[PDB]
Amino acid sequence: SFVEMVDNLRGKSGQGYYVEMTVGSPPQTLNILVDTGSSNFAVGAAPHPFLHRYYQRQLSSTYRDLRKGVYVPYTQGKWEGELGTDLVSIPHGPNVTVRANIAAITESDKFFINGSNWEGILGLAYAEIARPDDSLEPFFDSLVKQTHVPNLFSLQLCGAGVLASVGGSMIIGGIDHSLYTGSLWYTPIRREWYYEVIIVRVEINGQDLKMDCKEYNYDKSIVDSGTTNLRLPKKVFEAAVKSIKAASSTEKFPDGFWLGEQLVCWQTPWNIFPVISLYLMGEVTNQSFRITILPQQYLRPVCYKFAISQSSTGTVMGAVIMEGFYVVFDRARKRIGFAVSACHVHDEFRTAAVEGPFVTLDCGY
Ligand SMILES: N#CCCCOc1ccc(-c2ccc(-c3ccccc3Cl)n2Cc2cccc(N)n2)cc1
């Protein structure tokens, strides 16, 4: 039942959302980061200072070694592991068990987060970006292939409303209508590697940034639950900040705040910060729809930090964006739906919105 999947996500603010999963036989309980921005099922499988729990293959009667290694560097650090398969369940997702690939992380540099309370990552994106390569079938592909679970999942990330605790839901195999109000709007998945989408227009408080839309998707825009911030290409970030500074000129903040480095505290003038509208390409060529997020989303609690940051790898619509909405990763129809979340945080003057269509008279990069 979808009812039993509601609120199956937890996390700490800025440290991601995780779902409880079991691996192996007997079931080994682990908390797993729900990550639409990667495609590996990778779980700590060796002691680590930040890990209080980890996957123990030798305890699993159903573990099978793939006698294949996997190495994953990424500037900041890395993770390295040994590939195998084992039985996997999501106790509060579908009532099914799946033999999925597992990267048992045996060593990692700056991968695990201190106090996040998750022990692995569930990469929900496509095989194309899986490590070591696209032959390593991602978890969700195995799930759909092995079970009758419909090729669709939906994320309701609720945020907050010690680091603040966040809740949410991952509904696998369907759409839970009680999770959103109003209309579900779909934007095409441009390509099945990341959950790549097209942003055709953005405005800060109704004011168009007036950029060639290729700038919004340079070199790509993705929907990524494994990123906390709204990340924007340099040129768009600067214009966004400039425009947000202007609209909130009353009250001045250190540029260290706009840089997302330091917090700023009251004991909050929301109305001073503008709403941000992302226009996503519609299923119909020249149509688009906007998702409008409040400062309650792009100012996350710490006291808040500016949760909009610069990117050199294109737009990242992270949790900051997703927390306003019910997001449907309709993989069967290669599209992503956005609807106002039943849980999104808003005051008595503004509210996160999903509105369309908007029509125009080439945005992919
Ligand atoms: N939310 C939030 C905030 C908490 C951040 O939590 C984390 C903790 C760790 C990682 C991570 C380290 C290395 C990889 C990786 C790199 C390449 C291939 C496969 C993988 Cl697994 N990842 C996955 C990854 C990276 C970058 C973006 C996305 N979306 N996912 C990500 C987020």
Confirm or reject: Cβ of 40 under 6 Å from ligand 1. yes
As a whole number of angstroms, the longest Cα–Cα distance in the chain is: 63
* Contact in structure between 326 and 156 (CB atoms under 8 Å): yes
| Residue 126 · residue 192 · CB < 8 Å | yes
Residue 61 lies inside a defined structural domain of this protein:
yes
Residues 308 and 351 placed together within one structural domain of the fold: yes
- Contact 36 CB / ligand 1 (< 6 Å): no
Does the residue 73 lie in any domain? Answer: yes
Residue 38 C-alpha to ligand 1 middle, in angstroms? 7
Sign of dihedral through CA atoms 222, 226, 232, 233? negative
Is 35 labeled as catalytic in the residue annotation? yes
Domain boundary among 133, 149, 165: 149
Cα–Cα distance measured from residue 56 to residue 63, given in angstroms and rounded to the nearest whole number? 9
Which residue's CA is the closest to the ligand 1 atom numbered 17?
Answer: 72
- Compute CA distances 89 → 29, 141, 186, whole Å: 9, 14, 29
Q: What is the CATH number of the domain that holds 93?
A: 2.40.70.10
| Contacts (Cβ under 8 Å, ≥6 apart) of 164 | 12, 13, 301
Q: Residue 63 sits in which domain range?
A: 17-149
Same domain, 124 and 163: no
Within a domain: residue 236? yes
What is the tally of structural domains in the chain? Answer: 2
Cα(249) to centroid(ligand 1), Å: 35
224 is catalytic: yes
Name the residue with the closest Cα to ligand 1, atom 19: 38
Identify the domain boundary among 86, 121, 149: 149
d(CA 258, CA 240): 10
Same domain (yes/no): 196, 136: no
- Is residue 149 within 6 Å of ligand 1 at its C-beta? no
Phi, psi of 49 (to 5 degrees): -50, -35
Q: Rg of the chain's alpha carbons, rounded to an integer?
A: 20
Give the residue carrying structure tokens 């250190």: 254
Check 141, 224, 255, 347 and give the catalytic one. Answer: 224
What does DSSP assign to residue 244? H
Domain boundary among 149, 178, 194: 149
